[PDB]
Design a protein around this ligand. Sequence first.
Ligand SMILES: O=C(NC1CC1)c1cccc(NC(=O)c2ccc(=O)n(Cc3ccccc3)n2)c1
Lengths: 202, 214, 206, 206, 219, 204, 228, 228, 220
Amino acid sequence: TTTLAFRFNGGIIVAVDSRASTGQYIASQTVMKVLEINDYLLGTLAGGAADCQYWERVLGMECRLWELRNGSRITVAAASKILANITYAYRNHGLSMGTMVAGWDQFGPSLYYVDDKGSRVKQDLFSVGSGSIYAYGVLDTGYRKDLSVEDACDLARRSIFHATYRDGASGGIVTVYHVHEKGWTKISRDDQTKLYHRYFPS
Amino acid sequence: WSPYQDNGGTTAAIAGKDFVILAGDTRLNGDFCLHSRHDQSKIFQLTPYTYMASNGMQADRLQLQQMLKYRVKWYKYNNGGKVPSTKAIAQLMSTMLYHRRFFPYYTFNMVVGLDEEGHGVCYSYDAVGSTEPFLYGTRGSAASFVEPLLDCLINRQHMTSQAPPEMTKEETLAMLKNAFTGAAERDIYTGDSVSFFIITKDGVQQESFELRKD
Amino acid sequence: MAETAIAFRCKDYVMVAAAGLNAFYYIKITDAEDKITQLDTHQLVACTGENGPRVNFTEYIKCNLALNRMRQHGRHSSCESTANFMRNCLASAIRSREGAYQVNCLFAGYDTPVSEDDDGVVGPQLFYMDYLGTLQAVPYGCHGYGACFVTALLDRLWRPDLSQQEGLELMQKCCDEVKRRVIISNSYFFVKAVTKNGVEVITAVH
Amino acid sequence: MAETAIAFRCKDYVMVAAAGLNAFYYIKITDAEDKITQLDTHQLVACTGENGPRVNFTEYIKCNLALNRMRQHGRHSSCESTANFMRNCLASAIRSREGAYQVNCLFAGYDTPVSEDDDGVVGPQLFYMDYLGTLQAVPYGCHGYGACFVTALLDRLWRPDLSQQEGLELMQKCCDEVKRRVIISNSYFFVKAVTKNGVEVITAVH
Amino acid sequence: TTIVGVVYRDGVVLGADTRATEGSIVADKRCRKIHYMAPNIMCCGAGTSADTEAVTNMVSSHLALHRLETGKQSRVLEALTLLKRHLYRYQGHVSAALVLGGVDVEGPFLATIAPHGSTDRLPFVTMGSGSIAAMAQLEAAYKDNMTCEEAKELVASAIRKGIFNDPYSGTQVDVCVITKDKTELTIGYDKPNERMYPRQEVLLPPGTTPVLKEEIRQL
Amino acid sequence: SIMAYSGGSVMAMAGKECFVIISDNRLGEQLKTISTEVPKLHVVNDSIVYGLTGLRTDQQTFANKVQFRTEMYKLREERDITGKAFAAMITSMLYEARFGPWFVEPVIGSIDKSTGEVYLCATDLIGAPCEPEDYVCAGTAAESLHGMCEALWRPGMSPEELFEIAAQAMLSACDRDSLSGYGAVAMIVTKDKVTTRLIKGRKD
Amino acid sequence: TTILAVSYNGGVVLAADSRTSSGTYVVNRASNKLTKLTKKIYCCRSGSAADTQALAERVSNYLGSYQTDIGAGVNVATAANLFQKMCYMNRWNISAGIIVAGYDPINGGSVYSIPSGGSCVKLDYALGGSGSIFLYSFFDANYKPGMSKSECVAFCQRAVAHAYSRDGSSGGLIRTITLDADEPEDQTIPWNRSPYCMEKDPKYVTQATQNQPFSSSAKITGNRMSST
Amino acid sequence: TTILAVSYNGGVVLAADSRTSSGTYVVNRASNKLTKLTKKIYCCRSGSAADTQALAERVSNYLGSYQTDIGAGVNVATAANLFQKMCYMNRWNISAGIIVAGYDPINGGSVYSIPSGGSCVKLDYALGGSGSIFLYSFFDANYKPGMSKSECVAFCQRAVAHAYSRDGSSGGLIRTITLDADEPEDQTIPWNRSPYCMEKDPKYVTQATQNQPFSSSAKITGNRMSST
Amino acid sequence: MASGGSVIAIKYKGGVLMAADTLLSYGSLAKWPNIPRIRLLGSHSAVCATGSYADFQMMAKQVEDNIERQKMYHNVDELSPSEVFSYLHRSIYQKRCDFDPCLCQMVFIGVRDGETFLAGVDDVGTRWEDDCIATGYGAYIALPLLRQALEKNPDGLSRGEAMRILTDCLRVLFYRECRAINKFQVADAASDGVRISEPFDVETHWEYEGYCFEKTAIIR
Ligand SMILES: O=C(NC1CC1)c1cccc(NC(=O)c2ccc(=O)n(Cc3ccccc3)n2)c1
């Protein structure tokens, strides 16, 4: 798995691959690893797929009940905090989740990482998963706040691609989403092998 | 003493545009021995349009199958008679596998059926419910043989040759016979026979198919 | 241990510093997680350990202090109170189902007269806590891999009566020694002080 | 893993960098142990791992090369020769009484015509070795915790035909990424290149 | 793997299945598990294929050599002693398990060698994962002074019990008959497993697979 | 697992008076990919080719031992080793090391230059041979390669038909193995002609 | 395994059951655990077939060499002594209960037990095997010494039968050999003429009453044998 | 421990040795392992003294309550059934071989074995304890059913004596009780009037010949008893 | 740890036969050779277990009672064999879910209205139905033989042929299963209900020429 997200001036990009390994055999080249929780919030899946799928789905339900109960969308900080409180409550039950929660609340764009132990960190840039060690190399070097939205998706797509190319567990299709004031858009899906031929055209 | 036993065998499904085909082999294995060449326990109808397939421990798929069968009866009663869709059962199953997270069912399940638009679909699960829709599928002892072959003949991503037509339900069935047949040859825990179920809107054909007994 | 926190108290301030590093195994995520949490106007806690515990423990204290200040018509708890509350919370946890909060604290505060009647202790207070709920007043203390370098440096250089400026200088040598000698990059330190006038952030040192 | 080494080869040089850090558990002893060992005029080996193994392995190679150059009237071994000698020495060790030499190498060299008759390969050579004696020619490679950051950065930026100057720039981004993202302070890197004209130390990058 | 031997009036019949697994996958559907050991002695092996091949080869070779020294026919009991001494020395680590059958001047001789180097001379035997299933058909049907056909049928029958009941065993039955005079090995004496769906020729016409480079070289 | 550490898969299959042997191209340390240009085939002579899988250092070591043995053979004997001898030899070498094995799993294809009889042989790491008539294979993707070769392979294919099903099989299977990939190299070996081909694959 | 040996005036009987078991399956139901060392000296083997066959073959070899060299018969003590040596040298790596028994003209018939630790003890009779634990009381209660050859043979057959009727690890045939001044007489009682088994003892014919029918009384009747 | 019980016409005998051992030391050499459950129903206990005493006290309690409540005698089956229940409920946490035997007027004398797993089996006789392994053959060989009370008592004493002459973990006294229509007769044979022991069996009086004197011959004489 | 060894069963035309030795062992020790291991359940079924007799006894009591009470307390038809078997299987499973497993494999037979039923259930709740079934070493030794007899008589076996083949297997189990005795009972389920035979023995052969002392001797 490789996932990344970053905040820039234009919003948040989120990008992921689509491979699910069962160790050495590849179970799927087609996992969707961005969960569209609400329509202002995305979360990524890394770690135990079930754990992330389940608790992100719960988060989506808590987000929605918030909205019904209180007439107003939940903030990202709260959403991430909800998920962090769950993973903390279950820190001793060996969940495997590394998650990002990105969205754009009334305080602008916000990005959190929440892990299986209840950590909840809010940075402008993250990568997560076996292939993160690779994606940060490409990402750390190209990242600037003032990226356009093409340049930011290009950067995000390339970083995932570089992760896929090198890391055995990452692969398949690089999906990129943007999170902007009016919600999120899925910007693109590309097979990582088409991307090889686009970025390196010998 | 383990509470877990692998009883082996193999399920596979392939979706089509207005059908899905689902198959399981009928061998039920014990330790170092064979209990039955005629076990039909792997495939379990949930509604007319939805089936589940399960590999792993025969005992746990019997339990699971019943647990689901009753959630589906509750659903029918609580929803004025209507049956849950394949997608609803698919999500239900994920949730039930996951509720046992801690002492998991040792099943590798598939849920297959027809979507609303009447298109075949397959959800495969891991033991706690990670799923996703796919057009095909195979869990079990032969999975790692069959799955790459289906990849090759359905998706053809390494063939220059332009992709042939959409596979009809007769051609799809042949394809699964050919691939069960090769698996029986090479996976020692798959053999004996394959029950096929062709699910369409018009009902479910069954078809038995002999594999090699050794 | 990766994130070193340091504190010491002179006559008129207690100064606390703590490394920004946030890691994931070897991957450095940032050098800018402020791990010094202000709990009250004159109380702050430099807390080290995994984000999960550190945040849950500190947010619990910060809430309970706040709660108690409501249910007590705006009155600030003393630093010794707060430290004992933290200690008891840590301690209770090591015998709980959930287990120890794996965090280590320096709790620092400055006690001012809460009213005309307060005959209590006035001035800087600093406490060393460990995750098991050991709790000891100290004139300086540290946690983390740098803890020992710095502790010996403070034993050499600290005096009870440093000026606020001699203190910035001394804290800088402390941070610097931790950069010189710990394999783990504690590149940036956040530093705060508490004085009669509350918590000031200190950007002159890092 | 604590000490990251990096290398890559362009048309006219192979450039190698390696972190000065020497540690003892968490105690940083220096950021200035040169771990790039020149083996011959046109051959150097960036080698990472504990001082014991690293020095004994490199000193063995350096000697045996030197020995062989005596017993061969001043003639330089080819880089592929040397790399195979190193590989075989590593490999042999994993099945020895003593055990694997826990070190990982980048062996880099520049092969020049050894005589008028030499029809052999001319130019830069770089090899990735691991302690078990895996040996692979590569256009760039890395070892250590930074290895993967850098490897993906080089996959992005490296081209076969960089100038010696574009190479210094690129190596600097490599070193910098290792400082940005590895928890372990690889603060200073030694960098050398091999060219037709031998091993040059490079102080412009660190 | 299922191997079987029986003694009959004139000789010994051995039998074997032919599935060579690796893990839980049939690497070879039709391997020979009945090794030549001498002109009048065969061996079948079970256990760790490599150990079985090494050991039979070694002994086969030794007896070939011993036969030139002595000028005589190899005795089955020399074969057995060389085997058990070897296996005993390796304390089971050489996990060969052999049925050894021949005919010498002293008559038919069938024996098992277990990996730890125990032998058991007996009139019928089995080894291998299919051994129990097959042994049960021998206990059920064996009798003394079986004719050669009786013996072959029984050996096949016994091997079929492993083929059909042991996962590790399969495909077909090979038998070897050893009389005083000669040794007739018969591959596929029973083939009870054709394939039941004819293979479906998947058409992949030249140029179908994308090639990047090509080097041709003539000889 | 030590046999999976370096990744890589190899497969050989027989046709009429030809075989194909094919490797993937990856070299890893587990999930870290180090190189995508490491085919695992070695050519012994015009009629024998083999591939090794397993721990890469042992592939290298053992291949070098095999090249010593074979070059020595060819000098002493003044002829090329044949695939049967060659495979016997290998098996012997691996078994010498039975109690401390080479973590490799060779896969050997060969063709008698006269006859056109084709001999394949794969071995486990202690040198148990597997001499089937169809196809042999080894490495990280070996389950899936058996899948594919069973399905696609048929008797008496010609070099070209045989290449296509070798490549589709290697790629389909490698697309399901994390530790094998980056396309493949294939050698088609007839009596008359050796043809090497580098085949395009996924970059994951 | 059940092995035993008994002295009588002028010789010994050895006896054994015939079963070799890999736990709970019988790999050999007709093993011969009475192994010849010299003409008139035998061992009974228990424990690891492999181990005991290797030692017996080794000792028999040494003893044949030794007999050819001294040009005379071998004593049972010599055979026991060698066996003991080898059993003791390899005590950590083998599982091996031996009995060495036989006849030599100087000492008559003798019996030595060499149990797992490699002790060697000269006795009137000896028992070994998993089945022996069942015969100690049988001998204590029913063995009187001074029996004739024929009485002693029958008694050892009974003793083995008793043992293997209760030890799951013993079974099959009962092999005996006598060893004295005359020629060795081997004998083999097949199981179906065993002089004892539980399946034919009249006191084990009535079934335990475990499956009582559902009744209105506590009075116990019998097992429910039929549905009606 | 050696415990056993045997049926005779109209009742049962229970018997046991008296030794309780902490491995190889005897903590109690006069334990009473025949424990009263009701007037005419007893258990013999083997395994953990603690466990078996706790269960017997519990079952005896329940059974007294039950007898007072139904106003009539208790059946041995009831006692066995309760014992079985408790032994099975706690099978993982206790070491406990029980025999429940006694007399009730409906069923006469009965014997139930309740071994470690908590099976309950109704038998003619039952054996339990570490020492029982020694009596199986003794019964197979020497027990004929249909014995009188007095014969049956003597036989059980012999049987215990045989067992505890070979089991290191059994020893001491032999306690018996008979249970039938009449009053219970307990008996206690002290060790020194044991009806069997090896130390007084004439076939174990001659010493094994292990310590031969240094001689010029292979002829075995005797043990060297004196230095001269 | 009293335990029971193999059980084997086979369907014939008309019924089912199940057979078992009458022996409980304790480890290797053959402890009681006169135990009626087959047990009738209700009016149409019988059951026999391999493995822990205590587990068996508690489980079989639970099922017997359930059957008897369902029928005595409600004016309902006795449970069919499949229904009883179902119950027993769910019971056994529930125990594996409580980590309190019923450590037996069981064979179950029953007949009602000339419908026959033969199934196996195992400690973990595996269950299966077939024309023959065995447990313990039965499953390794006898099933192949029983299976072979049903391949050869695909029209079904007669009672005599079935009893001939059952008997052949008992004999083989006798020879090759260590913890066994040559005393067996066979339950026969038919129309009429189930009868358990009196205990019986099978003829054994031990006098093959190759079993002789001279041949089996290790040293000449
Ligand atoms: O993929 C996981 N497990 C394997 C089984 C699939 C898996 C499972 C759980 C968590 C993770 N986290 C990461 O990998 C990771 C790696 C680098 C990185 O920067 N971050 C974000 C972060 C921010 C602040 C503090 C700590 C982390 N996260 C992965």
